[PDB]
Each structure stands twice: as structure tokens, then as C-alpha cells.
Amino acid sequence: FLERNEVKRLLASRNSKELETLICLFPLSDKVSPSLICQFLQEEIHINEKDIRKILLVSDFNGAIIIFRDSKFAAKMLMILNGSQFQGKVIRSGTINDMKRYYNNQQN
């Protein structure tokens, strides 16, 4: 598709207005892959075309880039939703850099 183009452009995006109205969800375990992500997103986050400006699956550091409707909720939800327990692991989130950190934690 055309997700990878934006996952890359978003990875590098310098606009912090973006990283505020968006974050990379990191609850994707070794038992939870890209498709399952979205299901689970609409499943728990109630994500749709309304609350989500756009959603892309980030499977090279198991994350999910999500822009809810506003910066206040993206970070606020990050804090209230994450730090949870799912699939026998603790699920957490951050943005593009924090996901890269978590990635290290994943690959190592």
C-alpha cells in the first residue's frame, strides 16, 4: 500500500505538532501482529474513521502509529491506556523515538 511511505515520513517528521496529536502504540507482542493490531484497536480504542485521523501498522519495531483527533487526547490516552497487561506481557506506548527504544528492548 502507501503506509510505509508515511511510516517513514512520520518516523523522520520534525513537526512536534504531529508527535503530539499522535503516538506509536507498543502493545504488539510476539503473539500480536499488524492485522490483529487494528482489530484490537477498534476493539479496545474504539478507533474508527472518526476518532482516528489515520492509522498505520509499524511492524519493524512492533508499534502502531495513531493520530487520534487531538494532541491532548493522544498523550492523555497514551498515559491512561498503556502500562497495561496483555498477552502475558506489559504493554506500553510512546512516540517514534520511545518506540525505537522499546524496539531495542524487543530485538535484544
* Among the listed residues 83, 66, 79, 58, the one whose alpha carbon sits nearest the alpha carbon of residue 7: 58
Q: Which residue has the cell 502475558?
A: 88
Rg (CA), the chain: 13
Q: How many helices (H) and strands (E) are present in the chain, helices listed first?
A: 4, 5
Q: Which residue has the cell 477498534?
A: 42
Q: What CATH architecture is 1-108? A: 2-Layer Sandwich (3.30)
* Grid cell locating 68: 487520534
